[PDB]
Structure formats: structure tokens, C-alpha cells
Design a protein around this motif. Structure first.
Motif, short mmCIF file in Angstrom:
data_model
loop_
_atom_site.label_atom_id
_atom_site.label_comp_id
_atom_site.label_asym_id
_atom_site.label_seq_id
_atom_site.Cartn_x
_atom_site.Cartn_y
_atom_site.Cartn_z
N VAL A 100 0.98 -1.28 -0.17
CA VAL A 100 -0.06 0.09 -0.07
C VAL A 100 0.92 1.40 -0.05
O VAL A 100 0.42 2.46 -0.64
CB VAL A 100 -0.85 -0.02 1.17
N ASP A 101 1.97 1.29 0.88
CA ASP A 101 2.71 2.21 0.62
C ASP A 101 4.38 2.22 1.03
O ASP A 101 4.43 1.00 1.69
CB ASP A 101 2.22 3.50 1.83
N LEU A 102 5.15 2.98 0.91
CA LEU A 102 6.55 2.85 1.03
C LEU A 102 7.31 4.27 1.05
O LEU A 102 7.14 4.87 0.17
CB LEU A 102 7.08 1.81 0.07
N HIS A 103 8.10 4.49 2.05
CA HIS A 103 9.12 5.83 2.04
C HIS A 103 10.10 5.73 2.87
O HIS A 103 9.96 5.00 3.99
CB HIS A 103 8.09 7.08 2.07
N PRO A 104 11.01 6.53 3.05
CA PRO A 104 12.11 6.42 4.07
C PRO A 104 11.63 6.94 5.37
O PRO A 104 10.72 7.84 5.37
CB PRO A 104 13.14 7.61 3.45
N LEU A 105 12.11 6.16 6.38
CA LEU A 105 11.68 6.49 7.87
C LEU A 105 11.99 8.16 8.26
O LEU A 105 11.19 8.70 8.66
CB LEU A 105 12.39 5.51 8.63
N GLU A 106 13.16 8.35 7.79
CA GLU A 106 13.61 9.75 8.05
C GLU A 106 14.24 10.55 6.97
O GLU A 106 13.43 10.72 5.94
CB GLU A 106 14.54 9.92 9.29
N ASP A 107 15.48 10.49 6.87
CA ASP A 107 16.06 11.18 5.77
C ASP A 107 17.18 10.30 5.01
O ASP A 107 18.06 10.92 4.34
CB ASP A 107 16.87 12.49 6.30
N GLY A 108 17.17 9.12 5.41
CA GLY A 108 18.11 8.34 4.76
C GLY A 108 17.43 6.93 4.11
O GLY A 108 16.22 6.65 4.32
N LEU A 109 18.39 6.34 3.21
CA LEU A 109 17.90 5.26 2.39
C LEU A 109 17.94 3.75 3.10
O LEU A 109 17.79 2.86 2.35
CB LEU A 109 18.60 5.10 0.98
N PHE A 110 18.56 3.78 4.34
CA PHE A 110 18.99 2.59 5.13
C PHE A 110 17.88 2.42 6.08
O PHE A 110 18.04 1.35 6.70
CB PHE A 110 20.15 2.73 5.79
N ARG A 111 16.76 2.81 6.22
CA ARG A 111 15.66 2.82 7.22
C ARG A 111 14.29 3.25 6.56
O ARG A 111 14.25 4.49 6.13
CB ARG A 111 15.82 3.37 8.52
N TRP A 112 13.55 2.33 6.47
CA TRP A 112 12.24 2.30 5.68
C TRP A 112 11.02 2.15 6.47
O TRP A 112 10.78 1.15 7.44
CB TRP A 112 12.11 1.48 4.22
N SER A 113 9.74 2.81 6.06
CA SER A 113 8.54 2.49 6.60
C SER A 113 7.53 2.10 5.60
O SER A 113 7.61 2.63 4.50
CB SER A 113 7.95 3.99 7.30
N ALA A 114 6.92 1.26 5.57
CA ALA A 114 6.05 0.69 4.83
C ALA A 114 4.49 0.35 5.12
O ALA A 114 4.35 0.33 6.47
CB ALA A 114 6.44 -0.59 4.25
N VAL A 115 3.59 0.05 4.36
CA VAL A 115 2.05 -0.05 4.60
C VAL A 115 1.69 -1.27 3.75
O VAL A 115 1.73 -1.03 2.41
CB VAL A 115 1.16 1.16 4.54
#
Length: 183
Positions: free
Chosen positions: A31-46
Motif C-alpha cells: 500500500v505504501d513505502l517511504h524513507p523512515l527519516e532522511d536516509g535510504l537505510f531505514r524504511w516505513s511501509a504499509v
């Protein structure tokens, strides 16, 4: 260095498929995906619970940590799980027309307190040909196909091992109905 380039490319690949009414990705459960903060090494997804499973028609949030040697090693992934107190506080701010997510994940291969998914699941499957998308898809699959071989939740795993489908379903339904909130 160049791993960031790969991660970015994969992210954009997912974004492209997402902002669109019928790319196949919509039936995979992402459903969704984006960086957790400002880096490419931690992610938030739905992700959405897969059809014809007790998890169907409900959303869950995920946190993804990327190793430095990626993609030589798989991402570490966990469900976002909150305490009852926090959830209830979130529910008093909600709207009857907002995006609601369930913040408890009862599953044979998930730590009910921390949300951690057993490393076995990805370690046994992962190869350098895999992407972020394939990992997400793999977890959506896991929601429909638990393996009682590597349990982090004893009760659910045993319910499944005794083939008590009704109690399993009822439990998942209970947590979906009682522990969901906005955002």
C-alpha cells in the motif's frame, strides 16, 4: 556508495507502480513505502492483509532496516506494535473517515511485543536478485502462509498445529477490531 543508487532505483520502481490504478502491484498487498527519516537505510511501509486470510481487509505498518552490505544480506523487518495505552490514546484523536491501521500483530512468526519477524523467513529465501518489493510481497505471503517450524508466538503456532482454524481467525479478528487507529 552505489548501494544507495540501487536502493533509490528500487524505491522509485515501487513509487511508479503505486501511483497508478492498475499496475499488478495493487493486488500484491503493498500500500505504501517511504524513507523512515532522511536516509535510504531505514524504511516505513504499509501493507494490506491478503485475500481469503483472516488478515484480509486491514492495514499494517512495517519498519525496515537495511544492512550495509545490501543486497548481500536481506533487510531486517518488523511490524509496528504499540502498547495498549498508546493505542487507546491514538484512538481518541481518530476520525471516522481516516486511514486506520491495526497496531497489534498476532501471528505464529511474529514477536507479539516487539513486532519482530523471525529472521528464518527471509534468510532462507533471500538472494541478490531480490528487491525491496519482493521482500514486502514475501511478508504479505507470510501472512497467508505461516510456518510453525520457526515460531515467535507459541499460542498462535499451536492453534495452527492443532488445526483450530476458528479460534485463530477469531483472535486475529479480535485484535483487528479492538486495536486499530488513524495514521
Amino acid at each position: 556508495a552505489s548501494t544507495e543508487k540501487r536502493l533509490l532505483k528500487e524505491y522509485r520502481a515501487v513509487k511508479k507502480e503505486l501511483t497508478e490504478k492498475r499496475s499488478p502491484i495493487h493486488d500484491t498487498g503493498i500500500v505504501d513505502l517511504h524513507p523512515l527519516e532522511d536516509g535510504l537505510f531505514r524504511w516505513s511501509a504499509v501493507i494490506r492483509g491478503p485475500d481469503q486470510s483472516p488478515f484480509e481487509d486491514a492495514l499494517w505498518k512495517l519498519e525496515i532496516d537495511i544492512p550495509t552490505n545490501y543486497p548481500l544480506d536481506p533487510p531486517k523487518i518488523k511490524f509496528v506494535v504499540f502498547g495498549e495505552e498508546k493505542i487507546r490514546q491514538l484512538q481518541r484523536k481518530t476520525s471516522s473517515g481516516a486511514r486506520k491501521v491495526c497496531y497489534k500483530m498476532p501471528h505464529p512468526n511474529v514477536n507479539f511485543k516487539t513486532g519482530e519477524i523471525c529472521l528464518d523467513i527471509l534468510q532462507q529465501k533471500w538472494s541478490p536478485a531480490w528487491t525491496l518489493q519482493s521482500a514486502l510481497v514475501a511478508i504479505v505471503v507470510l501472512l497467508a502462509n505461516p510456518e510453525p517450524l520457526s515460531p515467535l508466538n507459541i499460542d498462535m503456532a499451536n492453534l495452527l498445529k492443532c488445526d483450530d482454524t476458528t479460534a485463530y481467525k477469531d483472535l486475529v479478528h479480535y485484535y483487528i477490531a479492538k486495536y486499530s487507529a488513524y495514521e
